[PDB]
Amino acid sequence: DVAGLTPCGESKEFARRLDGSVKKLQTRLSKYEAGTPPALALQKQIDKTKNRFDRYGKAGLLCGTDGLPHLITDGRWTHSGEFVIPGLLFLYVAGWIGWVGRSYVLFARTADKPTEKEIIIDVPVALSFVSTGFIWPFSAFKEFTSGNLIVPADEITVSPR
Amino acid sequence: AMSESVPFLKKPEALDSSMAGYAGFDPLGLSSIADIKFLQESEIKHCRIAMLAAAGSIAQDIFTFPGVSKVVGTAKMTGVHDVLVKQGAMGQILLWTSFLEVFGTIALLETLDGKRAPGDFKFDPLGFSKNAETAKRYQLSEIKNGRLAMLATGGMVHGYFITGKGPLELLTNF
Amino acid sequence: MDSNFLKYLSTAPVLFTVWLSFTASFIIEANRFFPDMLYFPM
Amino acid sequence: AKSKAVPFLSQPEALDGSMAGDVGFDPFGISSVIDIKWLRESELKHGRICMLAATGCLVQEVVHLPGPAFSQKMALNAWAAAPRGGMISILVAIGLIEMISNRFALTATDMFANPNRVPGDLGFDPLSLGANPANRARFELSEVIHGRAAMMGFSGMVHQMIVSKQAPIEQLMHFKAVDSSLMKLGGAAGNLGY
Amino acid sequence: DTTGFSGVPSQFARPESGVYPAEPTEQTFLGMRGPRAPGHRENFGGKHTATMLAIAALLWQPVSEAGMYRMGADGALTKSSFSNMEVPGFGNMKKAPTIESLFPFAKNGFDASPALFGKGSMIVVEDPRDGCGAYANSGACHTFLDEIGDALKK
Amino acid sequence: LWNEGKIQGKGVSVIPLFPRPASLDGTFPGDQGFDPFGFSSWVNMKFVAEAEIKHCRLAMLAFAGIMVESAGISFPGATSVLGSSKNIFEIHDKAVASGAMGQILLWVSFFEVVAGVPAMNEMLNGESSRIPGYYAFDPLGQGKGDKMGRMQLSEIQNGRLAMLAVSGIVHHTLITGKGPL
Ligand code: CLA
Ligand SMILES: CCCCCCCCCCCCCCCCCC(=O)OC[C@H](CO[C@@H]1O[C@H](CO)[C@H](O)[C@H](O)[C@H]1O)OC(=O)CCCCCCCCCCCCCCCCC
Ligand SMILES: CCCCCCCCCCCCCCCC(=O)OC[C@H](COP(=O)(O)OC[C@@H](O)CO)OC(=O)CCCCCCCCCCCCCCC
Ligand code: KC2
Ligand SMILES: CC1=C(C#C/C(C)=C/C=C/C(C)=C/C=C/C=C(C)/C=C/C=C(\C)C#CC2=C(C)C[C@@H](O)CC2(C)C)C(C)(C)C[C@H](O)C1
Ligand SMILES: CC1=C(C#C/C(C)=C/C=C/C(C)=C/C=C/C=C(C)/C=C/C=C(\C)C#CC2=C(C)C[C@@H](O)CC2(C)C)C(C)(C)C[C@H](O)C1
Ligand SMILES: CC1=C(C#C/C(C)=C/C=C/C(C)=C/C=C/C=C(C)/C=C/C=C(\C)C#CC2=C(C)C[C@@H](O)CC2(C)C)C(C)(C)C[C@H](O)C1
Ligand SMILES: CCCCCCCCCCCCO[C@@H]1O[C@H](CO)[C@@H](O[C@H]2O[C@H](CO)[C@@H](O)[C@H](O)[C@H]2O)[C@H](O)[C@H]1O
C-alpha cells in the first residue's frame, strides 16, 4: 500500500504476532485450574490481546514486514488519525495549558505580593483561568493582534551584545 | 374586583368589558403571560376555522359535491384527509389559506402595534354592521358561536375517532 | 473549614501533586476503559 | 442568620434571598469561592438543557421523526442510531449559539463584563412572554425550580436507562426490578483487577 | 481581591474593551434582545421576521412539491425530477442544477409535503403504555406500582 | 355558631392532655387548639386550612359513596358495566377498567388545575383574600351568618369525622375481607 507496507488485516506477520502472543498466555494458562483467580486473570489478558489485534486489523493501519503497525505521518488524510488528528487534540490541550498559565501569571503580577500567588495559588481565580482555556485560539489570536501578547523589543531586558 | 365567571377568583387584570365575549374568564392567568391582542386574534382565528369546520362536518354529512364520492371512499371527517392529500384538494386549500395567512401574519403584527382591532379584516361586502349596536351585538354572537364551534369540532372529530359515524349519522343512529 | 488549612492546600507542592495525580488518574482510567489507543479511530 | 434550607448551618454569604430559588442552600460554600453570577448562569444553563433533555427522553419515547435512523424508543440508543452528520450539526449549532448568545463574552473572565449582563439573561424572549413585570418573580422562580427538577429527573432517567435497558415510560409500564446479579457497583480493585 | 469566576476582566487582569453597550429591552421574534444599530429593530424586527417566516413557509409549499408534473393521455400526472429538464445551450451541461439541488428531499428519502413531513415519512406516534393499566395487571404488564403491590404482598 | 372559648376558639382544647399551642391562633374555623407536633408555627396556616377542608369534603363524599355502594344502591345500568360485588376495592378496579374513574379523574384534575391551583396560589399570595376552602358554591344559600360560625364548624367537624370514618372503613374492609353494611 503506502510506502510498500501492507494493511495489518491481511499481513501474515501480524497474524503470527497475534497467534504467538496468545500462545504465550495460553501456556501460562495451561498450569492453572479453571475457576482459580490466576486462570481468570490470564484469560482476561488473552481477551484483551485478541481485542487489540482485532481492532488494529480493521483500523486501516499499515503493518511492516515485522508485523507491527506503522504510522504514516506525511499529512495524508487516509492516515490522519495517527498523527494529524491526535496532534490537533494535543495542540488544543497544550495551548489551553499555556493560555491558562499565561493568564494566571498576568493576574499574579497585579497582586499585592506577586510571588506569593505563584507558591500559594489563588485557587478560585486559577480555576476561573483553567475554565478560560476552551477558546484559547480565538482568545490568544485576539490577544496577539490587539498588542497584548507580544511586548515590543525595547521592553525586554537583553545582554549588552 | 372579583371574576364574574369564577367568583372565588380575582379579575384577570388584562381583560375588560370593551372586549368581545368577555366574561372575566381567565382563571389560569394566560393573559398575563402573553399579549392579550395576540390571544384575542388567536381566539378569533380558532373560532372562525372551527366554525367553518363545524359547518363543514354538518354539510359533508348532508350532501356532497358532484363527483367527489369517487375520489374519496366511504371515508368521512379526518378519514378524507389522507386521500384528498393524494389528489391536490388539500394541497390547494393549504396553498391558498397559507397565502391568506402570510397577510394574516402582517395583520397580526399590525394588531400587536395597536393599529387594528384583532380579527378586524374590514370584510363587510353585504351590509350588516352599519349600526353600532348591531356591530357590537354581532361581534358578541361571533365570539360565542365560535367558542361553541371549537368545542363542537372537538366533539365531532372525537365522535368520528370513536364511532366513525359523523355528526348527522351519529344523530340518526345511537 | 479553616482558612489557613485551605491556604496550605493552595500551596504549590500540594496543588502540583493533587493536580498531577488527578491528571494521572484520568489517564489511567481512560486507558482502563479504552485501552490500546495507538491512533485516533477513523 | 441560619440557613432556611439547612437550619444547622450558617446562612451563606452571596445568598441574600434576591435570586429566585435562593432558599439558603450552599453547605459546601461554593458561592463563597465562586461568584454567584457564574453559578446562577451555570445553574440556569444546566437546568434549561436538562428540561429539554427530560422532555427529550419522554417525547422520543412517544413521538419520533420518521425513518429508520430515528426509530429508537430507548433514548440512549438514539445517540448511536441518529445520523452522525446531523448530531455533529447539532453540536456545531450549539457552539455557534453559545458564541452569539453570550456575545463573545464566554469565559469566566469576560462574561458579565457588561454590568447590564444578568445571570441567565441571554436576551431570549422571542414571544415577549416576560413583557409583564409582575410575572417575572414567579417565572424566574418557576424556571429555576423546573431546571433543578429536570436536572434530578434526567439524571435519574439516564441511570435508569443504563441499569434497565429500557426507555423511561416503558420502563415504568414494563417494570422489572433489579436482580443484582449484574450491575454491581465498583469492584475494580476488590478483585485486584480483571 | 478577585471573587473567582466573577467575569469582570479587570479583576483577572485580562484586557477589556471598556466599551460596554447599553442593553435595549426591544426583542425580535426570531432574534435575541441585544445592542442593535439605530433603526435596526423597526426595519428588521418582529414584523420583518414573522412576515419573512410566513413568506418562506408559503414559498416552501411549491418547493416541497417541486417536480415536473406532466399529464399523460389519461388524467393521471407523473412527477419527474427537474433534472430531466435538459437545457439547450450550455454544452456538456445538458442536465441543469435546479431547485431540487438546493432542496434534495428525494435524495435523502424525505418526501416533503406542503405542511412538512408527508404520507411517505410522517411523524411516528406510538403508545408507550402498550394497552395496559397503571395497576392491577396480568403477567404481560408489570408496572412499577405492581412491583410496589408485589413487594407489599409476598 | 362560632362560640369562641367553648369550641372553635382561643383557650379551647378538645384534648387537655395536649397543651394549647401559642402558634395556633383562634382565627381559623374549627380551631380547637389541637397541635401537639406544633406544625402551626412553621406551616403556612392558609394552605393547611384549605388543604384540611378539601380533605374533609373529599372524605365526606367518600363516606357517602362507600355507604351507597356497600348498601348495593346503584344508578340504573351501572351494575352491568361495573363490578357486581359491593366491595369498594373491587368496584374501584372495575371502574378503572371501564373508564369511569378516569373520567372522574380527568374532570377533578381539570378543576384543580384551572380553579384549585389559582385559588390556592391567590389565597396564599394575597391576591383575592379568599377564606380557605371557599369555592363560592352556595346554590341553595345556607350561607351568610350561619356560614361564618355553625356551618364552617359543622363542615370541619363532620369532615374530620368522615376522614377518620373512611380510614376506618377501608381498613375494616381490608382486615375483615368483607364490606361494611
Ligand atoms: C447549513 C445548513 C444545513 C444543511 C444544508 C443541512 C443538511 C442536512 N442535514 Mg443538517 N442541520 C443543520 C444545518 C444544515 N443541515 C443545523 C443548523 C442543525 C441543528 C439544529 C442540523 C441538524 C440536523 C439533524 C439532526 C439531521 C440533519 C440531517 C441533514 C441531512 C438530510 C436533510 C434532509 O433530509 O432534509 C429534509 C428533511 C427535513 C427538512 C426535515 C426537517 C425536520 C424538522 C423540521 C425538524 C424539527 C426541528 C426542531 C424543532 C429543531 C429546533 C431547534 C432549532 C431551531 C435550533 C442533510 C445533509 C439529517 C441527516 O444527517 O440525515 C441523514 C439529521 O439527522 N441535520
Ligand atoms: C383547554 C385544554 C382542555 C384539556 C382538558 C383535558 C386536560 C384536563 C386536565 C387533565 C389532568 C390529568 C387528568 C387525567 C387525564 C386522563 C384521565 C384518564 O382517563 O386517565 C387514564 C388512566 C386510566 O386509563 C384507563 O384505562 C382503562 C383500561 O385499562 C380504561 O379502559 C380506559 O382506557 C381509561 O380510563 O388514568 C390513570 O391511570 C390514573 C392513575 C391514578 C391517578 C390518580 C387517581 C386519583 C387520585 C387518587 C390516587 C391515590 C393513590 C394513593 C397511593 C396508591 C398507591 C398504589
Ligand atoms: C452533586 C452530584 C452528586 C453525585 C452523587 C454520586 C452518586 C453516585 C456515587 C456512588 C454511588 C454508590 C457507590 C457505591 C459503589 C462503590 O463504592 O464501589 C466500591 C468501589 C471500590 O471497589 P471495592 O474495593 O469495593 O471492591 C469490593 C468487592 O466487593 C468487589 O470486588 O469504590 C470506588 O472506588 C468506586 C467509585 C469511584 C471512585 C472515584 C470516582 C471518580 C472520582 C471523581 C472525583 C471525585 C468525585 C466524588 C468521588 C466520591
Ligand atoms: C430580502 C433579503 C432578506 C430575506 C429573504 C430575509 C428572510 C428572513 C427570514 C426568512 C425565512 C427570517 C426568519 C428573517 C429573520 C430576520 N432577519 Mg431577514 N431577511 C432579509 C433581509 C435582512 C436584513 C438586511 C436584516 C435582516 C435581519 C433579520 C433578523 C434579526 C434581527 C435581530 O435579531 O435583531 C431576523 C430574525 C437583520 C439582522 O440583524 O440579521 C442578522 C438585518 O439587518 N434581514 N429574515
Ligand atoms: C446552547 C445552550 C442550551 C442547549 C441545548 C441542546 C442540547 C440543544 C439540542 C438541540 C437539538 C437536539 C436540535 C435538533 C434538531 C433536529 C433537527 C433539525 C432534525 C432534522 C431532521 C432532518 C433534517 C431529516 C430527515 C429524514 C432523513 C434524512 C431520511 C428519513 O429516513 C428520515 C427523515 C424523514 C426524518 C440551552 C438552549 C438549553 C441554554 C443555553 O442557551 C445554552
Ligand atoms: C422562555 C421562552 C419560551 C420557551 C420555551 C421552552 C422550550 C419551554 C420548555 C420548558 C420545558 C421543556 C420544561 C420541562 C421541564 C421538565 C421537567 C421539570 C421534568 C422533570 C422530571 C422529573 C422530576 C422525573 C422523573 C422520572 C424518574 C427519574 C423515573 C422515570 O421512570 C420516570 C419519571 C419521568 C417519572 C418561548 C420560546 C415560548 C418564547 C418566549 O418568549 C420565551
Ligand atoms: C391536626 C393535627 C394532627 C393529626 C391528625 C390526623 C388523625 C389526621 C388524619 C387524617 C385522615 C384520617 C385523612 C383521611 C382522608 C381520607 C379521604 C380524604 C378519603 C379518600 C377516599 C376517596 C376520595 C374515595 C373513594 C372511593 C368511592 C367513594 C367509591 C369506592 O367504590 C371506591 C373508593 C373507596 C376509591 C397531628 C396529630 C399530626 C399533629 C398536628 O400538630 C395536629
Ligand atoms: C447548503 C450548505 C451551506 C453550508 C454547507 C457547508 C457544509 C459544511 C461541511 C459539510 C459536511 C457534510 O457532512 C457530511 O455530509 C453528510 C451529512 O449527513 C454525511 O453523509 C451521510 O448522510 C448522507 C445523507 O443521507 C448519506 O447519503 C451519506 O452516504 C452519509 O455518509 C457525512 O457523513 C458528513 O460527513
Side-chain angles (χ1 to χ4, degrees), chain A, chain B, chain C, chain D, chain E, chain F residues 1-49 51-181:
Chain A
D1 196 350
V2 178
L5 296 169
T6 71
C8 287
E10 67 179 1
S11 67
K12 296 183 289 292
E13 302 95 8
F14 196 63
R16 71 188 182 182
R17 291 264 180 192
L18 159 67
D19 285 306
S21 306
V22 176
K23 293 183 173 68
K24 290 176 69 67
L25 277 165
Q26 288 177 355
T27 68
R28 293 187 49 208
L29 182 79
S30 278
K31 65 186 287 184
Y32 293 111
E33 278 82 354
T36 64
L40 295 183
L42 282 176
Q43 185 56 53
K44 304 309 163 298
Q45 300 179 215
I46 300 176
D47 294 343
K48 281 179 286 192
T49 298
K50 290 168 173 172
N51 286 3
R52 187 184 325 109
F53 276 93
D54 178 66
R55 197 201 313 108
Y56 285 2
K58 66 169 64 64
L61 297 159
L62 271 62
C63 276
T65 182
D66 49 15
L68 304 169
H70 290 191
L71 305 190
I72 308 302
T73 65
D74 52 357
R76 68 183 74 231
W77 300 95
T78 190
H79 286 99
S80 61
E82 300 151 23
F83 180 79
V84 178
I85 296 302
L88 282 171
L89 277 73
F90 178 79
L91 288 174
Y92 186 60
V93 179
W96 188 320
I97 302 166
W99 181 249
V100 159
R102 183 185 182 267
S103 298
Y104 190 81
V105 302
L106 294 175
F107 159 80
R109 288 176 183 177
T110 76
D112 58 357
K113 58 183 175 180
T115 63
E116 195 191 41
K117 298 291 183 182
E118 299 184 353
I119 57 168
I120 308 166
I121 289 91
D122 205 13
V123 170
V125 174
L127 280 173
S128 314
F129 283 131
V130 304
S131 62
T132 66
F134 72 109
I135 45 164
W136 78 264
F138 295 96
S139 296
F141 189 74
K142 181 103 178 154
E143 182 87 338
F144 163 67
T145 47
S146 74
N148 294 117
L149 198 62
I150 304 298
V151 304
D154 61 358
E155 270 301 327
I156 313 182
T157 178
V158 286
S159 313
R161 255 62 276 283
Chain B
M2 299 296 287
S3 300
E4 293 85 3
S5 63
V6 191
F8 53 94
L9 286 190
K10 64 169 174 50
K11 296 294 289 292
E13 75 208 320
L15 299 175
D16 58 356
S17 298
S18 58
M19 295 185 192
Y22 164 82
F25 185 62
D26 188 43
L28 227 44
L30 293 161
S31 71
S32 66
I33 329 295
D35 198 11
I36 196 49
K37 282 165 151 291
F38 183 101
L39 267 53
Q40 289 183 259
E41 177 101 17
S42 170
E43 181 167 47
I44 308 178
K45 202 161 296 174
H46 273 100
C47 282
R48 294 164 174 171
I49 295 175
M51 276 158 134
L52 282 191
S57 311
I58 300 295
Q60 270 156 248
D61 279 22
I62 295 174
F63 73 99
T64 290
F65 283 116
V68 199
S69 292
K70 317 174 191 173
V71 175
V72 198
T74 65
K76 48 190 326 179
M77 304 288 289
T78 80
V80 316
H81 169 272
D82 277 353
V83 47
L84 290 164
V85 158
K86 277 297 295 292
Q87 186 250 335
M90 308 286 309
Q92 279 291 109
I93 303 172
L94 184 51
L95 176 87
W96 289 100
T97 52
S98 297
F99 176 73
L100 290 182
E101 218 90 280
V102 170
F103 308 124
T105 303
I106 302 157
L108 164 66
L109 299 156
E110 233 95 356
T111 255
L112 302 171
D113 297 350
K115 310 196 300 297
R116 68 181 281 273
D120 205 350
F121 290 102
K122 298 287 181 68
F123 186 41
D124 277 327
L126 315 178
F128 292 103
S129 277
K130 292 182 175 68
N131 181 31
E133 190 66 32
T134 311
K136 272 303 309 185
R137 187 231 307 183
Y138 280 14
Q139 202 186 350
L140 181 52
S141 291
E142 188 192 19
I143 185 73
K144 291 196 185 172
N145 276 300
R147 289 167 180 173
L148 171 68
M150 300 156 60
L151 297 167
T153 296
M156 290 178 287
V157 304
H158 283 92
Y160 181 81
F161 290 140
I162 293 285
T163 58
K165 296 299 178 183
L168 275 297
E169 290 196 341
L170 193 57
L171 287 185
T172 62
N173 288 350
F174 274 118
Chain C
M1 190 184 290
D2 198 11
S3 68
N4 277 312
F5 178 69
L6 292 172
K7 190 184 289 183
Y8 161 70
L9 295 180
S10 305
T11 46
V14 176
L15 290 180
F16 186 81
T17 302
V18 165
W19 185 259
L20 275 70
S21 289
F22 158 74
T23 288
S25 300
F26 65 71
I27 299 170
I28 281 158
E29 293 291 349
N31 274 275
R32 181 156 70 95
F33 293 86
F34 284 145
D36 302 329
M37 297 312 297
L38 188 55
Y39 48 88
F40 189 89
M42 64 177 287
Chain D
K2 297 292 183 182
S3 292
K4 270 72 74 177
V6 192
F8 58 91
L9 303 180
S10 295
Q11 207 271 310
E13 287 88 358
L15 267 52
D16 43 34
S18 76
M19 288 187 172
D22 195 328
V23 82
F25 182 63
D26 188 26
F28 292 171
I30 295 146
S31 66
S32 72
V33 167
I34 307 193
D35 185 54
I36 194 66
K37 287 164 85 82
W38 186 262
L39 291 162
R40 179 38 70 85
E41 180 84 5
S42 193
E43 192 189 23
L44 280 180
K45 193 167 284 179
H46 271 89
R48 287 158 183 173
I49 295 171
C50 259
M51 282 187 260
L52 298 174
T55 316
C57 299
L58 304 170
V59 171
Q60 291 170 183
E61 176 56 19
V62 181
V63 302
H64 304 145
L65 291 178
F70 291 128
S71 63
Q72 297 297 323
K73 291 183 165 296
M74 203 277 285
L76 280 193
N77 286 349
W79 176 257
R84 293 290 185 270
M87 293 287 288
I88 298 279
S89 293
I90 290 166
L91 193 72
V92 167
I94 284 167
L96 299 169
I97 288 165
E98 289 270 48
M99 75 172 184
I100 290 107
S101 66
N102 290 278
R103 299 175 201 171
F104 300 150
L106 329 177
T107 56
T109 61
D110 68 356
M111 192 184 293
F112 322 113
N114 198 353
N116 301 348
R117 178 63 155 85
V118 175
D121 295 47
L122 308 183
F124 178 73
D125 207 348
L127 306 177
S128 300
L129 292 188
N132 185 21
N135 301 341
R136 184 68 183 182
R138 174 175 58 116
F139 280 5
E140 273 177 342
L141 179 49
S142 169
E143 188 198 30
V144 170
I145 302 311
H146 272 85
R148 290 167 187 182
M151 291 188 246
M152 298 310 287
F154 172 75
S155 311
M157 288 183 287
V158 171
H159 284 100
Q160 289 157 228
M161 291 170 223
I162 296 156
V163 163
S164 64
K165 305 192 164 306
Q166 283 182 334
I169 305 170
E170 65 91 16
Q171 199 249 337
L172 282 181
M173 293 297 296
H174 296 271
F175 190 81
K176 187 263 180 178
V178 175
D179 287 7
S180 184
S181 312
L182 62 137
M183 285 305 303
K184 85 157 304 302
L185 300 167
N191 61 349
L192 306 180
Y194 305 97
Chain E
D1 301 347
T2 307
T3 322
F5 294 87
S6 75
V8 195
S10 50
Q11 301 191 5
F12 302 100
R14 287 280 294 128
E16 36 186 0
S17 51
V19 186
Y20 296 125
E23 178 82 335
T25 58
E26 299 151 335
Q27 176 103 29
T28 76
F29 153 66
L30 282 180
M32 266 178 169
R33 147 178 58 94
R36 298 296 186 265
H40 186 266
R41 302 289 203 182
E42 307 298 320
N43 290 328
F44 309 108
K47 199 272 169 188
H48 171 88
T49 176
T51 300
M52 288 311 179
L53 192 57
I55 288 174
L58 179 63
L59 285 190
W60 161 277
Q61 299 172 2
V63 153
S64 65
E65 292 295 315
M68 273 158 44
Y69 296 97
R70 276 83 189 92
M71 196 183 308
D74 57 344
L77 75 162
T78 312
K79 178 178 174 172
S80 187
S81 176
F82 279 132
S83 75
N84 291 40
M85 187 166 38
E86 282 199 351
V87 282
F90 279 73
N92 311 325
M93 211 207 60
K94 300 142 208 311
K95 294 171 52 186
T98 183
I99 187 78
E100 292 160 348
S101 158
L102 312 201
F103 305 87
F105 308 114
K107 176 69 194 308
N108 300 275
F110 178 55
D111 186 52
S113 101
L116 191 65
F117 301 119
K119 242 355 232 172
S121 282
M122 204 155 50
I123 309 176
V124 186
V125 187
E126 197 61 38
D127 191 26
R129 312 178 306 168
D130 290 323
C132 58
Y135 187 69
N137 305 298
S138 78
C141 161
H142 196 254
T143 41
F144 173 70
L145 303 144
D146 279 348
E147 186 60 71
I148 308 180
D150 282 21
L152 256 307
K153 182 188 55 180
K154 187 172 174 58
Chain F
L1 283 178
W2 194 267
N3 306 343
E4 44 183 2
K6 316 294 293 298
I7 195 175
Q8 197 182 23
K10 302 203 62 58
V12 173
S13 299
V14 271
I15 322 189
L17 174 66
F18 305 115
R20 176 68 170 180
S23 49
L24 248 198
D25 36 21
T27 158
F28 286 91
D31 73 1
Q32 310 300 10
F34 175 68
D35 217 311
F37 297 161
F39 294 143
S40 47
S41 172
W42 62 268
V43 300
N44 200 317
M45 278 309 295
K46 295 271 199 61
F47 171 81
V48 307
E52 179 179 41
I53 310 195
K54 287 182 50 187
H55 270 103
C56 293
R57 296 165 174 180
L58 251 198
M60 282 181 282
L61 284 184
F63 171 80
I66 289 178
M67 283 318 105
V68 162
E69 290 158 78
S70 292
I73 310 178
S74 65
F75 271 128
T79 322
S80 316
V81 185
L82 299 193
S84 57
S85 176
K86 301 174 294 186
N87 184 22
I88 46 189
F89 311 123
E90 204 267 348
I91 301 183
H92 169 275
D93 182 29
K94 282 293 191 61
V96 162
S98 81
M101 277 290 100
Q103 270 293 297
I104 296 164
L105 165 75
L106 170 81
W107 290 101
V108 165
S109 303
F110 173 78
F111 185 87
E112 297 277 39
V113 169
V114 308
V117 172
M120 173 193 64
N121 286 348
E122 79 175 5
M123 169 196 57
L124 288 161
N125 273 80
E127 311 301 308
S128 282
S129 189
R130 193 183 62 99
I131 82 183
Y134 178 71
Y135 283 94
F137 178 79
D138 282 45
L140 305 171
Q142 267 270 359
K144 288 84 59 184
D146 303 346
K147 173 180 55 181
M148 304 320 178
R150 180 175 189 91
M151 302 314 293
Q152 263 167 29
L153 180 54
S154 178
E155 184 175 34
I156 217 57
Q157 293 229 353
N158 275 282
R160 287 157 177 173
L161 190 58
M163 274 189 284
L164 294 166
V166 170
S167 309
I169 280 151
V170 294
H171 292 117
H172 304 157
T173 315
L174 283 154
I175 189 187
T176 308
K178 297 296 175 59
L181 304 180

